[PDB]
Amino acid sequence: MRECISIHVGQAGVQIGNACWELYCLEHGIQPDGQMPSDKTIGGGDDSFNTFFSETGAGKHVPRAVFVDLEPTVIDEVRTGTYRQLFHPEQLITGKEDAANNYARGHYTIGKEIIDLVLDRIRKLADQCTGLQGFLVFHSFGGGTGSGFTSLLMERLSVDYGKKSKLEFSIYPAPQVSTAVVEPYNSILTTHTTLEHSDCAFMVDNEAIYDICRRNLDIERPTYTNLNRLISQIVSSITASLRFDGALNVDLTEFQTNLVPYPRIHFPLATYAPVISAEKAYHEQLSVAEITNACFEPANQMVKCDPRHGKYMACCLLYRGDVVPKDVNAAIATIKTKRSIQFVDWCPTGFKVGINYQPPTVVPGGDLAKVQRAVCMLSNTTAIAEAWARLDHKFDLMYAKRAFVHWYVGEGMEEGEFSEAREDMAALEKDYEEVGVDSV
């Protein structure tokens, strides 16, 4: 058992969910119709990939997923897309009027009309689970649905599934590909409302992903498809221990124990390597030492911040492919000598290591080279608070003039929800400062 249900909310979450499930299907040999010739257990099984796919009697492997959007445009492409037969129609939920980039409409006006249906659809999935570990919620910070409906959903899930684990992949806004001037407002509102209801949340800064595609993949002007293919590799690295078997495989929840020293401090920084074009990967194989080194180069982080000017509370290495503990330990030993890796005084300095032997897959037609080994580092550093500072600053510039606030008030919100949310973020930035001060 130990099933995981994925919930994809709004445009960003749905489209990133397409990239991820396509990748998962390629990694497990599941065809676009859901048939998996290597699964000899027809209709069931307790295999590792079964944490993410259920099986029908007719041999179809169905994602344990719900897609939700407050408008039909994006999910209609799943309904007509290459993987349409994979999903039962009841897993693809769409309203008629989107949130119009407004948290208040996602949480209150439009969102409340569909929340009950969504929770019934999730319930139909939980009921097919022998032991449900929890939920993975994919969504943007910036959209009206990703912010407002996600936080309404996370609230309801806490009520309906007690303290069952809730994890997030949250798309942090960037000016290069943003869609709305009010993204800072929706980010703070949803971060405030969700903080108590989420156990662990992986932020993905679109500017970091955007820079990596430009710098490392030579993509002149990255699209959502470019970003999402790279994002799905990182998501694949994180979920790979749940979906694959391995003697050296370490369960994500064992990493979670080290990544979350206090409930509110639950935002790991992800760094992924190697991201390299086919042209440059040719006749150039990156060793375990090289890809491990790349995890401490800030230009490979999913969030722009400077860990060199912050403090570590945890450091995890998730490898996949042709990697053995001997090489890893060697790589770490030289890194510790040559790099600025400072831990807070109250936490041990070791590096938790996990190795999955299944090597990384690439989507046909992508820009990523296929490589023999790759790594995702998850570290808890105070530096990630810089991402909160940038956003809280952008929120402050507008909120002092009350700019655009009338659109949220017109939907039923009150100014005190804005100030309350901003104060929580202020306390969060203060929390990250306190955990980095030495003991007395």
Binding site: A104, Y108, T109, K112, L152, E155, R156, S158, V159, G162, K163, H197, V409, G410, E411, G412, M413, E414
Partner: protein, 64 residues
């Protein structure tokens, strides 16, 4: 020690239940407060529009 063991597990149940209760009550007050506010704003928009109908009756009357 047995007495202490079942007080620990009772405390866990009591915190988890209280967390579920507070969340359920919190968003019930939030949604109820949000419906009142939005309705007050739409009602105010209509009250001012319906005043423009009154002012247009008067304007036609002043013509007679």
């Amino acid at each position: 020690k047995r007495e202490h063991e079942r007080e620990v597990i009772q405390k866990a149940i009591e915190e988890n239940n209280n967390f579920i209760k507070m969340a359920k009550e919190k968003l019930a007050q939030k949604m109820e407060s949000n419906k009142e506010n939005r309705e007050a704003h739409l009602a105010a928009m209509l009250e001012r529009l319906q005043e423009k109908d009154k002012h247009a009756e008067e304007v036609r009357k002043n013509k007679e």
